[PDB]
Design a protein around this ligand. Structure first.
Ligand SMILES: Cc1cn([C@H]2C[C@H](O)[C@@H](COP(=O)(O)OP(=O)(O)OP(=O)(O)O)O2)c(=O)[nH]c1=O
Ligand SMILES: *P(=O)(O)OC[C@@H]1CC[C@H](n2ccc(N)nc2=O)O1
Ligand SMILES: [Mg+2]
Ligand SMILES: [Mg+2]
Length: 323
DNA sequence: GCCG
DNA sequence: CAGTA
DNA sequence: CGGCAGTACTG
C-alpha cells in the first residue's frame, strides 16, 4: 500500500533504534510513514526526493531497492541487533541496558534470568515477556476500563473514567489499557490513587506494579499489570492517570495520542510561540536552542476542539489521529 | 536519518 | 542525574 | 550548524 521498499527500510530503522541511534531511527520512521502514506508507487529518484521526509540519502536507498530488489546495507547490520531487540523488549530495559547485557556476554532470556542483574521492573517484564508483546481485543480493554471505573465510582460516584490511547482511536486491538480519571467539581480528583489501588488489590485484580509513587500525594500515574478473572486470561498492562478537571481536554488529547500525533502537534505549537503538554496549552512562551526560558500564560481549553482551534487547526476525531 |  | 517510560 | 515533544517515576 503501495510500496515493499518500506519493508526493507523498517529492518534498517529497527537496527538503528535497538543500537541507540535515536535520531537516525526517527528520520527512517518518518520516511517509512511518508512511503506508506503515498498514492502512486515511487519509480524515480526525483519523485522520491519530492516527498517530505525523503532526502538525497533516503531516495538513493529507494532507487537501489527499485533497480536491484535488494538493499546492500542490510547485509552489514551488526550481528548483535536480534539479541539487543530481544533484551529491549523486557519492560524496564532499554537500549542502554540491552547493550550492557550484550557486552557482558548474554544472548538469551535464559542468560538474563540466571546471570543478569535485574531491576524490580525488569524482573516483572521478564516474568510476562510474551503477554507484554501480545495485544488484547478492544472488548477486553472495555472489561478492564469497566473494572477500574466500577472501583473508582464505588467510593466517589461523580468520578469520570475514560479509556484513551489506541482504544479511543477505534483500534481493534490494544497494547494496554490507558484509563484517564477526573472529577467535574475540580477538587475531588485529589488523593484517589490511595483508595482506587487499594480497592483493586482487595479484589486481586492488580498482579504487579511497575511505576506507582504512592508515598507522594501528587502521584500522577499508575503503570502496572492486571488480570481479569476466569480461565483463558492473560496478564494485561494497565496505565491510569488522575488529572485536575481544568486540565481535562489537554490530558485527554495527550493520552489519546498517537505518540507521533502529539509530537507533530507539539512541534507545531512551538512554531506559533506556544507550548502544548498534558497539563496545558500555553502562549507567549519565551525560548532560547529551543528550550523554555519563560513560562507564558495558560490558554482556556475546556474541550479538545479548543486546542485545535487555538493552534489554527481543524478538529480531528480520535480515529484520524494515528499520525 | 530529515529539514529549517 | 541517566535511563526508561 | 543543530533540533528533532514535553513531562513523570526510579534508584
Ligand atoms: C509512548 C508514548 C505515549 N504518549 C501518549 C500518546 C499515546 O496514545 C498515549 C498512551 O500511550 P501508549 O499506550 O504507549 O500508546 P497507544 O495507546 O497509542 O498504543 P498501544 O495500543 O501500543 O498501547 O500516551 C506520548 O505522548 N508519547 C509517547 O512516547
Ligand atoms: P510505556 O508502556 O512505553 O509507557 C507508558 C506510558 C504511556 C505514556 C507515557 N510515556 C511514554 C513514553 C514517553 N516518551 N512519554 C510518555 O509520556 O508512559
Ligand atoms: Mg523495553
Ligand atoms: Mg495504550
Amino acid at each position: 500500500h503501495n510500496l515493499h521498499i518500506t519493508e526493507k527500510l523498517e529492518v534498517l530503522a529497527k537496527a538503528y533504534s535497538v543500537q541507540g541511534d535515536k535520531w537516525r531511527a526517527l528520520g527512517y520512521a518518518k520516511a517509512i510513514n511518508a512511503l506508506k502514506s503515498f498514492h502512486k508507487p515511487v519509480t524515480s529518484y526525483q519523485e522520491a526526493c519530492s516527498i517530505p521526509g525523503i532526502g538525497k540519502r533516503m531516495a538513493e536507498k529507494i532507487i537501489e531497492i527499485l533497480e536491484s530488489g535488494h538493499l546492500r546495507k542490510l547485509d552489514h547490520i551488526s550481528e548483535s541487533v536480534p539479541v539487543l531487540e530481544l533484551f529491549s523488549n523486557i519492560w524496564g530495559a532499554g537500549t542502554k541496558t540491552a547493550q550492557m547485557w550484550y557486552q557482558q556476554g548474554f544472548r538469551s532470556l535464559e542468560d538474563i534470568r540466571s546471570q543478569a542483574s535485574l531491576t524490580t521492573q525488569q524482573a516483572i517484564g521478564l516474568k510476562h515477556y510474551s503477554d507484554f508483546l501480545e495485544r488484547m481485543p478492544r472488548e477486553e480493554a472495555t472489561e478492564i476500563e469497566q473494572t477500574v471505573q466500577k472501583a473508582a465510582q464505588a467510593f466517589n460516584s461523580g468520578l469520570l473514567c475514560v479509556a484513551c490511547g489506541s482504544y479511543r482511536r477505534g483500534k481493534a486491538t490494544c497494547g494496554d489499557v490507558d484509563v484517564l480519571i477526573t472529577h467535574p467539581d475540580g477538587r475531588s480528583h485529589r488523593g484517589i490513587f490511595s483508595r482506587l489501588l487499594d480497592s483493586l488489590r482487595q479484589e486481586g485484580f492488580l498482579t504487579d506494579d511497575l511505576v506507582s509513587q504512592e508515598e507522594n500525594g501528587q502521584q500522577q500515574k499508575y503503570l502496572g499489570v492486571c488480570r481479569l478473572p476466569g480461565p483463558g486470561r492473560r496478564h494485561r498492562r494497565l496505565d491510569i492517570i488522575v488529572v485536575p478537571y481544568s486540565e481535562f481536554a489537554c490530558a485527554l488529547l495527550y493520552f489519546t495520542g498517537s505518540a507521533h500525533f502529539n509530537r507533530s502537534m507539539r512541534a507545531l505549537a512551538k512554531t506559533k510561540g506556544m507550548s502544548l503538554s498534558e497539563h496545558a496549552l500555553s502562549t507567549a512562551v519565551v525560548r532560547n536552542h529551543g528550550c523554555k526560558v519563560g513560562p507564558g500564560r495558560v490558554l482556556p481549553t475546556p474541550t479538545e476542539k479548543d486546542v485545535f482551534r487555538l493552534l489554527g487547526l481543524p478538529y480531528r476525531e480520535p480515529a484520524e489521529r494515528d499520525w
